[PDB]
Amino acid sequence: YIYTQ
Amino acid sequence: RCHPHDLEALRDFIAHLEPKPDGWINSSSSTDCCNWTGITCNSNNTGRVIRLELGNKKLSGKLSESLGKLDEIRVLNLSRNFIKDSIPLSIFNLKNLQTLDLSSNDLSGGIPTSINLPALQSFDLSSNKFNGSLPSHICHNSTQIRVVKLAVNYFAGNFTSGFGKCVLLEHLCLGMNDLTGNIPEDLFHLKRLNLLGIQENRLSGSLSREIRNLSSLVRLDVSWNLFSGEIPDVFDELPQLKFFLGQTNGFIGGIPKSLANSPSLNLLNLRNNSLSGRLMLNCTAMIALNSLDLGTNRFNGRLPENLPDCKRLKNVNLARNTFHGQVPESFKNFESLSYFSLSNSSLANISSALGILQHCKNLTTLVLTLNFHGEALPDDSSLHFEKLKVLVVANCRLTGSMPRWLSSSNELQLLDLSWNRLTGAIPSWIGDFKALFYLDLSNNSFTGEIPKSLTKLESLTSRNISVNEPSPDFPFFMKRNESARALQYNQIFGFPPTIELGHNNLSGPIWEEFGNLKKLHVFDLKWNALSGSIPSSLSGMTSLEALDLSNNRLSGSIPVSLQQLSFLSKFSVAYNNLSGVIPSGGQFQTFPNSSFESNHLCGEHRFPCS
Ligand SMILES: *[C@@H]1O[C@H](CO)[C@@H](O)[C@H](O)[C@H]1NC(C)=O
Ligand SMILES: *[C@@H]1O[C@H](CO)[C@@H](O)[C@H](O)[C@H]1NC(C)=O
Ligand SMILES: *[C@@H]1O[C@H](CO)[C@@H](O)[C@H](O)[C@H]1NC(C)=O
Ligand SMILES: *[C@@H]1O[C@H](CO)[C@@H](O)[C@H](O)[C@H]1NC(C)=O
Ligand SMILES: *[C@@H]1O[C@H](CO)[C@@H](O)[C@H](O)[C@H]1NC(C)=O
Ligand SMILES: *[C@@H]1O[C@H](CO)[C@@H](O)[C@H](O)[C@H]1NC(C)=O
Ligand SMILES: *[C@@H]1O[C@H](CO)[C@@H](O)[C@H](O)[C@H]1NC(C)=O
Ligand SMILES: *[C@@H]1O[C@H](CO)[C@@H](O)[C@H](O)[C@H]1NC(C)=O
């Protein structure tokens, strides 16, 4: 899954 | 015919360097030096040498000591070469040198304890091998120095006092060294400094309140150090501050009121700090703010309702925080919002979130991953996001079907719905997005066959579709499973063009027409119910790198044509009904046994095996 931070 | 002194110095200089530049092949014979490559003289071209500018000449060798014999040289530029060893002492005594750029070479050793360069304006040693103590003693005899660039060196030891005596210093770049200790209080005397990079060192302690004394600051880069304590609330004293970069430190507390009131800030990056509490900005006060990164902090409470009142805020990354509740209703007015990253923030009511956010007409990229846990994905078809490019809502364990309101975002490029509870068939309109090069529906409950329209996806077939890549200010991260290290992509077009359908309930065959997608890098069908033959027409997918068919029920043999996939490095048919020979030689010999296991497949001349 793609995530961001 | 030029001066014998310059003539000599120049001949020695080039004696140590190869290759000889275009106009220097005559050097040992020619007497006219001012017309040699990269030389400038006073009078007209006819006097003493005032400029030696040999940057980016592929020059390999050492610096001659007789470089110190050019008495009139005001500018020495050797940057972007292969020059190595020590800087000659005599260079540090040139009375006329205004500009020294040695940046980006292999130079090493250290700077002399005694330097006299009264005319020096800018000093650039960055990107070399220099270690040791910082040459702050240069301030004694260069009273005019504007610019010190030391970045990208091996300087370790304390951030050394004494830069405060360069009274006219404007740029100071110390980034990417090994410096320890706190900022010497010396530094806070430089009231004309508009640029301080200290980023990417080992600096620590609190960031002193004395920093209010540097009232000329435009750009402050403190990133990637060990700083801690509260961010000092001095920012009304720094009225010219545009860029503040503090990311990856131990800063605690919230955003100081003065920073939250600064009309000049364009950019605030505090990501990956220890910050906490309510997030409060006065957006009526911050009229220049266009970009805000607070990611990987502990800000709590609701998302601040006044955020849309920053009329210029284009780029917002709030990910990985402690908020709660819904997206405020005022976000309907966030006219400037382009890129919105909310990942892993504990947000509620995706229904409200989407119904509000559809009103932000500039929204292009939206990352909602790890929020709305267990909620139902809104099917409500009045939802319209017209300019939407990148949509990531993943690992939210969302329920419902593939939302058809999405079909009206024609610009859509990357879609990630993976790791939800979504069910039903995958609808035909998913094949209608012309700019879509990446889609991850994996790890859902999807059923039915694979829609055939995925075979005529335009960005995956021709080269006649062309669009502009979205440009948010944050990277994206990609995780294979819950315990895998992530992959980083700084830009959207860094993602391989991908169809990822794995871990669903999909059934039926694999369309021969998948041979149409010439530009697809990654095709993942694994862990489904798929059946039938592996089509020979797949050999037509010419850009294919990874093909995962494992854990289906597929029958027949591996088609030999697959060995014509030139780029395929990653392949698995494991856990199927397949039979026969694995095709020998070429591409398939490189795959490990695990790629074929739990079938009836055998290596050539080994059938039957088991
Ligand atoms: C040195 O020359 C380089 C490359 O030719 C140029 O880009 C650079 O600006 C010069 N250095 C200075 C201080 O002007
Ligand atoms: C300044 O110049 C004098 C005379 O040239 C020299 O002796 C002295 O070492 C220089 N000071 C520094 C700190 O480089
Ligand atoms: C967050 O900070 C830690 C420790 O400072 C650092 O090791 C890590 O790389 C940071 N994460 C990012 C993405 O900057
Ligand atoms: C926010 O900033 C505006 C403009 O400077 C000011 O007039 C207003 O009183 C401020 N509000 C708060 C809460 O300080
Ligand atoms: C929205 O985007 C358009 C097109 O780039 C831009 O010109 C406009 O200023 C933006 N609107 C706002 C309010 O930021
Ligand atoms: C999400 O947030 C929690 C902290 O609230 C953290 O432990 C977890 O590592 C984060 N996961 C990702 C993928 O960002
Ligand atoms: C969530 O959002 C919808 C749409 O605004 C609203 O009607 C509904 O009452 C909200 N549900 C909750 C639990 O607040
Ligand atoms: C799919 O997603 C769930 C969470 O929604 C996660 O727990 C599970 O491990 C994932 N399965 C795989 C193999 O990715």
Side-chain angles (χ1 to χ4, degrees):
Chain A
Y1 60 94
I2 299 166
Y3 67 95
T4 227
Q5 52 155 293
Chain B
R1 298 201 40 98
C2 68
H3 206 283
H5 214 107
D6 299 333
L7 184 51
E8 174 258 326
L10 285 189
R11 277 177 183 160
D12 299 335
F13 161 78
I14 199 63
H16 287 109
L17 291 169
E18 290 280 352
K20 271 61 184 171
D22 353 303
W24 295 64
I25 316 281
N26 264 359
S27 112
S28 275
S29 196
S30 171
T31 185
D32 183 32
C33 54
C34 296
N35 300 283
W36 298 352
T37 301
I39 301 297
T40 300
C41 298
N42 53 28
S43 303
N44 239 23
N45 221 5
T46 63
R48 300 308 298 269
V49 169
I50 56 173
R51 274 124 85 160
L52 170 51
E53 308 172 88
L54 287 174
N56 197 29
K57 286 288 169 177
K58 292 296 157 65
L59 291 174
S60 167
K62 287 172 189 69
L63 297 175
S64 183
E65 222 94 24
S66 43
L67 225 30
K69 311 299 176 178
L70 302 145
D71 309 298
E72 300 305 300
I73 188 180
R74 304 153 55 97
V75 177
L76 174 54
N77 190 332
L78 300 181
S79 68
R80 334 228 303 255
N81 288 294
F82 319 120
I83 304 155
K84 59 198 174 70
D85 210 271
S86 206
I87 306 179
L89 236 64
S90 77
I91 282 181
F92 291 93
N93 299 266
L94 305 158
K95 204 80 180 179
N96 299 286
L97 191 60
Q98 289 163 336
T99 304
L100 176 64
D101 190 347
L102 297 186
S103 73
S104 165
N105 285 279
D106 282 287
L107 306 174
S108 60
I111 336 285
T113 59
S114 187
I115 298 172
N116 180 56
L117 297 166
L120 193 66
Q121 313 258 29
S122 72
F123 180 80
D124 189 349
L125 271 43
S126 56
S127 295
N128 280 277
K129 300 150 87 164
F130 301 108
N131 53 10
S133 232
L134 294 176
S136 41
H137 61 287
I138 198 155
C139 301
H140 197 263
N141 307 314
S142 319
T143 80
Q144 222 98 65
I145 191 161
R146 293 176 297 103
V147 166
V148 179
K149 296 182 170 303
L150 305 169
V152 189
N153 283 283
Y154 300 72
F155 289 107
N158 293 335
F159 187 158
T160 21
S161 177
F163 277 117
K165 301 270 180 87
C166 286
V167 169
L168 302 175
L169 207 55
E170 288 164 11
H171 293 1
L172 175 62
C173 313
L174 306 184
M176 308 173 51
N177 290 279
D178 234 9
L179 307 175
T180 47
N182 208 337
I183 299 171
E185 67 184 51
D186 173 271
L187 180 69
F188 308 123
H189 300 358
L190 304 174
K191 275 195 138 294
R192 281 141 297 263
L193 206 67
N194 64 43
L195 198 182
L196 185 51
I198 62 188
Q199 72 282 50
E200 291 170 60
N201 285 272
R202 283 174 309 171
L203 307 170
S204 69
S206 283
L207 189 44
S208 175
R209 189 153 287 250
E210 293 309 332
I211 221 169
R212 65 186 153 102
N213 206 81
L214 305 170
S215 61
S216 293
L217 277 178
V218 173
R219 189 169 176 90
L220 181 53
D221 196 348
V222 153
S223 310
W224 289 85
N225 285 280
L226 305 171
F227 292 111
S228 51
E230 301 230 353
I231 305 173
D233 179 36
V234 298
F235 291 90
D236 15 42
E237 247 86 296
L238 316 158
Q240 301 187 282
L241 194 52
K242 284 187 169 193
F243 318 94
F244 186 26
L245 294 92
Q247 70 270 26
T248 309
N249 281 290
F251 287 135
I252 61 173
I255 279 132
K257 191 190 184 171
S258 58
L259 196 53
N261 285 266
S262 133
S264 67
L265 256 200
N266 292 29
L267 190 135
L268 179 56
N269 185 348
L270 292 174
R271 85 155 296 272
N272 194 14
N273 277 282
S274 189
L275 300 173
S276 68
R278 241 80 181 175
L279 165 61
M280 303 151 306
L281 310 75
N282 179 336
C283 275
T284 307
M286 311 192 60
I287 74 242
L289 186 64
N290 73 270
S291 180
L292 173 75
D293 200 326
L294 304 179
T296 312
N297 281 286
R298 286 164 203 184
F299 290 109
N300 55 39
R302 311 253 327 183
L303 284 179
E305 186 219 338
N306 67 313
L307 251 207
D309 289 335
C310 288
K311 289 89 190 165
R312 295 182 77 85
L313 185 40
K314 189 162 158 146
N315 177 94
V316 183
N317 174 21
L318 296 184
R320 195 168 168 163
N321 271 277
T322 63
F323 302 108
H324 75 81
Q326 321 187 23
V327 176
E329 310 95 334
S330 52
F331 281 39
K332 274 185 289 289
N333 307 306
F334 218 143
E335 235 231 290
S336 44
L337 188 60
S338 272
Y339 330 104
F340 197 37
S341 117
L342 261 168
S343 280
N344 196 8
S345 280
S346 338
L347 298 187
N349 202 339
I350 183 167
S351 202
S352 128
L354 293 192
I356 292 159
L357 291 178
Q358 70 170 331
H359 291 295
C360 304
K361 309 294 173 181
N362 270 5
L363 190 51
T364 54
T365 80
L366 165 70
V367 187
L368 297 180
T369 295
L370 285 160
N371 301 282
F372 319 117
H373 299 286
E375 296 190 23
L377 170 65
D379 55 21
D380 307 84
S381 276
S382 205
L383 288 175
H384 185 49
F385 296 79
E386 185 167 314
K387 296 296 166 185
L388 189 61
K389 279 188 203 164
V390 176
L391 183 63
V392 183
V393 188
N395 197 4
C396 289
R397 299 186 57 79
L398 293 168
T399 78
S401 283
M402 283 283 295
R404 48 180 102 185
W405 57 256
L406 189 62
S407 71
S408 42
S409 301
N410 295 317
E411 249 95 321
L412 193 64
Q413 287 188 38
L414 183 154
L415 174 64
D416 187 350
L417 303 180
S418 91
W419 293 40
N420 293 291
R421 300 320 314 172
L422 305 174
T423 47
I426 308 165
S428 187
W429 51 258
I430 201 53
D432 297 352
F433 299 104
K434 294 178 177 162
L436 187 76
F437 74 101
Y438 184 111
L439 86 150
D440 188 343
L441 304 172
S442 69
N443 192 10
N444 284 274
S445 288
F446 288 121
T447 53
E449 293 182 335
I450 297 161
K452 249 201 181 180
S453 62
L454 286 169
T455 286
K456 338 250 213 49
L457 274 171
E458 287 184 21
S459 300
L460 301 175
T461 72
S462 61
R463 237 173 102 275
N464 300 333
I465 180 58
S466 77
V467 291
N468 301 303
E469 168 193 83
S471 49
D473 292 15
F474 38 88
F476 292 76
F477 296 87
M478 223 244 290
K479 258 176 80 163
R480 213 193 187 277
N481 66 31
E482 181 277 339
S483 50
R485 81 161 274 172
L487 296 176
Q488 175 164 352
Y489 296 94
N490 305 307
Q491 321 84 13
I492 296 300
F493 284 178
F495 287 94
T498 280
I499 296 177
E500 229 280 56
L501 299 183
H503 297 261
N504 278 288
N505 294 93
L506 308 164
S507 60
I510 301 170
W511 310 118
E512 299 163 10
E513 295 80 30
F514 272 117
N516 284 331
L517 308 177
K518 299 298 175 188
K519 297 191 53 200
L520 181 55
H521 288 238
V522 177
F523 198 18
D524 189 350
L525 295 175
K526 78 182 163 180
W527 284 90
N528 280 287
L530 307 176
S531 59
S533 213
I534 299 170
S536 255
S537 58
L538 288 197
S539 69
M541 301 194 269
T542 90
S543 306
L544 201 58
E545 298 198 83
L547 179 56
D548 201 334
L549 304 181
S550 78
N551 271 99
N552 283 274
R553 26 185 239 99
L554 288 162
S555 291
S557 199
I558 300 184
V560 170
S561 68
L562 255 42
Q563 245 167 350
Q564 276 170 320
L565 294 176
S566 287
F567 303 112
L568 181 68
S569 45
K570 188 47 238 168
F571 176 89
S572 192
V573 292
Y575 300 84
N576 280 284
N577 207 44
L578 303 171
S579 270
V581 207
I582 299 132
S584 57
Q587 213 76 358
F588 274 77
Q589 74 196 128
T590 55
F591 312 139
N593 304 325
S594 70
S595 283
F596 324 99
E597 67 184 40
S598 231
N599 284 283
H600 299 288
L601 299 162
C602 295
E604 227 210 318
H605 312 299
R606 280 89 205 187
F607 193 105
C609 47
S610 284

